Give the backbone structure.
Amino acid sequence: PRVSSSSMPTDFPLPSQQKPNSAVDYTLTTLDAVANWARQGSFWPVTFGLACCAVEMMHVSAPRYDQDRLGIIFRASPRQSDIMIVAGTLTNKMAPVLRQVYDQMPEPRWVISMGSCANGGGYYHFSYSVVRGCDRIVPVDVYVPGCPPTSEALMYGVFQLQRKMRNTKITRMWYRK
Amino acid sequence: MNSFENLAQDVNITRSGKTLIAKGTGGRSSRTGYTATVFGANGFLGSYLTAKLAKHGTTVVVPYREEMAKRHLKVTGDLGVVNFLEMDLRNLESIDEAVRHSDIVVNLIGREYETKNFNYYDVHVEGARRIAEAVKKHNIARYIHVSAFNAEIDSPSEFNHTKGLGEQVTKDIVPWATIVRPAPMFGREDKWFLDRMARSPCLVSANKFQETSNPVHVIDVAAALERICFDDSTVAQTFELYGPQKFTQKQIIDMVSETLRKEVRHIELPKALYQAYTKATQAIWWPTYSPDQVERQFLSQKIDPSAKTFNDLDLTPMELPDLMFKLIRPYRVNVSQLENKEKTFVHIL
Amino acid sequence: RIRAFTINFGPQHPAAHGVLRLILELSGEEIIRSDPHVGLLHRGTEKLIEYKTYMQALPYFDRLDYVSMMTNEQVFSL
Amino acid sequence: MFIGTIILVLSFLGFVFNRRNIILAFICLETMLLGINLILLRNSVLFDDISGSLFAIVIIILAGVESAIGLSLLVSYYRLRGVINSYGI
Amino acid sequence: MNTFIIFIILIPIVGFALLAVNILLAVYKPYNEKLGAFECGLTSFNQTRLAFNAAFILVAILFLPFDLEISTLLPYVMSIYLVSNYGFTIVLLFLLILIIGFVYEINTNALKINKHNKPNTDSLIYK
Amino acid sequence: MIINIVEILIFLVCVLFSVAYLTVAERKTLAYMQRRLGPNFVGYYGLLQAFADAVKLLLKEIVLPKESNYIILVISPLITLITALIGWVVIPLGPGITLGELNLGILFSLAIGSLGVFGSLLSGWSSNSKYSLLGSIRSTAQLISYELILTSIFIIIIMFVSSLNITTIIETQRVVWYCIPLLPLLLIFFIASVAETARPPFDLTESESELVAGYFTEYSGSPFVFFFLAEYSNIILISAFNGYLLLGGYLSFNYSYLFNILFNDYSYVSFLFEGLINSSAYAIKLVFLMFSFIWVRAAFPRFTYDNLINFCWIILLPLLFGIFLIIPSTLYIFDSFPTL
Amino acid sequence: SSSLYRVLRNAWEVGPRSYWKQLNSIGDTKSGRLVGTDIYGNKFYETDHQDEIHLRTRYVEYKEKDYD
Amino acid sequence: MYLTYYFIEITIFLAILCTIFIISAKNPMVSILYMIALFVIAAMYLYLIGLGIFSLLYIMIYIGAIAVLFLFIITLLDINSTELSVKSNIRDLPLVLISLIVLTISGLMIYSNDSILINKLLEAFGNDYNTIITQDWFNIENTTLLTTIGNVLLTNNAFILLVLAIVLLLGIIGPISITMKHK
Ligand SMILES: CCCCCCCCCCCCCCCCCC(=O)OC[C@H](COP(=O)(O)OCCN)OC(=O)CCCCCCCCCCCCCCCCC
Ligand SMILES: NC(=O)C1=CN([C@@H]2O[C@H](COP(=O)(O)OP(=O)(O)OC[C@H]3O[C@@H](n4cnc5c(N)ncnc54)[C@H](OP(=O)(O)O)[C@@H]3O)[C@@H](O)[C@H]2O)C=CC1
Ligand code: SF4
């Protein structure tokens, strides 16, 4: 028990406010940029979409607003999808099913909530068989609003999620910024 | 309908003077009135604690360290209940900032291995000194500080030494802090107790496993901790939270192996070679078994009789053998009357 | 005794059009008994039309059968 | 001759003392056939002739058709009894 | 040391290295609801044994006697000049003995699975 | 010793790149068939897309479900990987340019394509489910059933050469290719090649089976990158087999007169120029062939297993017996048997 | 259209520095006519050219590396 | 240079080792996978002796048809199996040891022709003399081994190829005729 004194700083920047200074900092920032950019340029959702908002997702697969040109492809199994899209309603009969699909996906996982029926119930908010948004079931990162949220707006929600992937800082975090 | 189980009453006043009228029936969309800051809420104990805390609508303030873990807490409270804000232990403005509006505050910041940034002295007594100095400055009712079992200053293990030192420093700064000392904690995907025994290639140790400690379920620790959090009888009291019956490690591993129906490995090589091996594995980024956790393989459960148990807050902890089967379920592997009955089905079409 | 192996075409399936649970009991590859389950999308739109006026009840119809909106609008309007 | 004789004898004793299932008995038969092959192919190489290689390339095909026939015999054995015993037939 | 055997040693070390960089660099973090096989977002009971059709097993039992011929035609194709006019007729006869067993197989319709979806052949005789 | 390790380094790095950009080129051309652009957000014109997939895919975790043998689950990607990659030795990029020149290279090429079935079938038992096992059954039965006619097409071609060496076939081919006498053989070898990889003209497992993602549904990370690499290595490997025994291997035209104009003497620039022409001819054969695979993917629906087995065993194989009888009889009628 | 001549002639008209900037920006090479600029600072362009599909005519060139 | 000497002996040891994992493996199909490994060890030995042709015939025919058939059986059929418990096979162990000794020695016996029994066995072990390989220039064409097999299967033993066709026919007719259920 020899150590009895600490020399830790009282002013040290938060991770949202910190810029790199040392050669190890630029090294971990470059390595982090490689990892985050790999997480963006390939971007694989599971095609959970079930109702009105699923056709609007099939307009993101359409040749006018392409998703292949962004790197997006529907691996239709949650074991391989990075992310999930709750695109449509969530009744009380499907809430364990939605969770069991979300439980399976490998650990770097996000989820975007497409539509107004998928965040806060929506048009069917006061109904006996509905979940008032998948916020109760799955932890959601980006909310895309719109009752048929325009393919423009769904793509904008995807760009917002990719911006959240820019500042994930998986390797700067381990340095304890 | 739902009901406020945690509260004795409707209208509760704090010690600081704030008056808290709980609204509505129990449940998700209701609000209790309390503002609570749980430090370390991404941890193993803290997830169950802020699950139980935001269940009835107490506003939970979560200072987080990384952005990717904390997502799993947002589902447990209503909209507006749980509030995430970033914090480093080094910036005093963030510790100053997180506890500023809290009616109650708990920390569980405790790290079992030394880092390049923090030793044991940095996280256990100096971080607790910074948090408790903030809580003294802001006049917060009900600061409660969790520390380890077997936490004394005379002990040779560094962990237990600086936990006892952290308890003494948070007694010096805030006199009205409840200090709570739980036993080893088994839960679902726990740290080193059952998740380690269910998957381990070798399960190597010292001591020939004969250390004595009893394990407590973690929803029991979180339930006892929230039942502390709300009554004012538990101010300035030290609590021992130890399970019903005392175990040894070979007994626990026999209990795990009889429910797995698989023979878990046993090595028991000498201490100095083991210590040098842990010293070698400290230089790797993912969290490895600590070398001062070797010293805690000798230290057994030393209970203070001058403390208050589960019996005070009206809880009976669940035993490990009744609950071994549920936590060890995924690692479980799995004659003539059948053959007299299978001679009537069709198998080739 | 023809013993039948039971499967679902559950929800998470591309050819199930999203919401369709379909218990199929097969013997080899032939289906000897089928059983569609449904209710995974059911929301009680018809209990809700009774609490809204006719003009407010108008969107409940193009919400259902969401591939062909104007026809669902047309049947309620007629 | 050591590798073919050792494969033949160890495969033969593993066949004889099989009490655990039946597919071990089939694969012990096939490893026997491999051992007889090895002994013969070496004798062809040491004697400078294709002659034993002629018997080898014929017994390859006969081991194949033995597998095809006997595994259809097993499917016939399994047709009436929806499980195969551990102790044997 | 030819460059043939560097390759057969060298593909595995590449594969072991890619498997190792996955095991080292990705997190592990499992639990019970993550574990468990996938069928469409619904768990179920698996039946201990299920029945199958005879054509399923018959494809791969029948596969081997045709495969053994195709490797029996492989000694001939290398010696086709030496056995001029004579080994030709022997290989003809060999292939013809095979072809009549094959036309047995195609006349029995052994690999075809029928459908029990009969359209109710029997008409409506009344009283 | 320095010279054989740098040649195998450069052939490795040329083939392991060319299986990565195959998948990029596939998404590109499948997009333009469907009147949409391919990826263009990852490189300057969409290139190094496959590197984005690969670097992310190595960062996903590996989950090993509770019903599974964990070893078998991770060893079937390794054996399918190496088996789809060991067959890249024996192809020549010019006369006697292989990575091992052996006297019987077809028998090796035909024994490695026999080893690739296991990583389907064995992968069915890892995570043993009765809805997964039977899908692995259907896949393995299809896979062997079309490997039969693959091997048979080979032996019909070796009737003309009577040598299991491969550059011997391509040197034999200088008088005439083997596609232009044997035109129906090109069509049925192409469709057996589409079958042997389980491409999505002839697929049932990835789409139609009770698993949503084929036999490899439950995977993540390294066990998916190895299968993904192995399928497209299988693409370009059976494309190579077509390139040497049915189309010209490295042969485009005579190019003696162009040399007698240009050069004066044997020098390293002359061997470099000749190597560029030979491997350019081989590459344009192989690239037209991968375009044919991607082109037949675009236009067509898929098969029932009954349609598939009725296709192979009842239609194509009796026709193949007629081919066995007609071609040595044609070599017989005229006085022409091929000499060793 | 998707021809090489269109991207080649637009690369010649726009110039190499702005070509490199548009290539880091978008995949396409576009030549417009400066209709106007934004209060945030975002130049907008409109395309005369004959071989342009519908909904291709107008576009933005942003200012920031992080664009919305 | 002399690292490349003991290869044959290594394969023998390796082949021995593989058989112990065949007869003692908890899962069946894991032991059939060890048998596939034993075919690979055999093909290693056949390349190593000088027969590079056969090694690929073993990998084609045995591994790629017979083992694929076996694995294909074990998948969709029911087979119980018991583990190698010590209590059920410790009663077998003495007859195992006696048969190991006798069958091994007596397999090593008939390669030799002295009337004395002990002189038969020692001639099994006296092999350490190195055969001298001389270059003879009498052969003008690349008759490989497979060419000679195709000359002797087709002229001198054409009837064996033809009776073999009857056997391959039987291997077609039989499995069909069992597993039909005609009408
Ligand atoms: C006088 C001399 C004798 C003259 C005859 C000459 C004989 C030699 C010619 C051999 C060429 C054979 C080519 C393969 C023929 C396949 C036959 C076929 O089309 O399949 C028929 C099958 C339907 O079978 P069936 O039951 O009879 O239908 C009756 C409906 N009541 O339907 C099916 O199975 C579905 C069709 C599957 C076809 C596979 C398509 C996949 C890929 C197409 C490859 C296209 C190649 C493009 C490549 C690039 C081209 C530039
Ligand atoms: N067997 C056991 O579990 C025992 C544990 N305890 C004590 O209970 C408390 C929590 O136990 P447990 O849940 O199991 O373990 P934890 O995983 O919760 O311990 C770490 C927690 O505190 C955070 N933490 C560690 N170091 C720091 C730091 N410098 N700054 C900020 N946060 C930090 C961690 O952040 P992050 O979430 O990002 O990792 C995490 O939330 C600890 O105090 C422990 O000493 C008591 C006796 C035995
Ligand atoms: S969000 Fe809107 S369009 Fe989508 S399913 Fe719900 S009501 Fe229909």
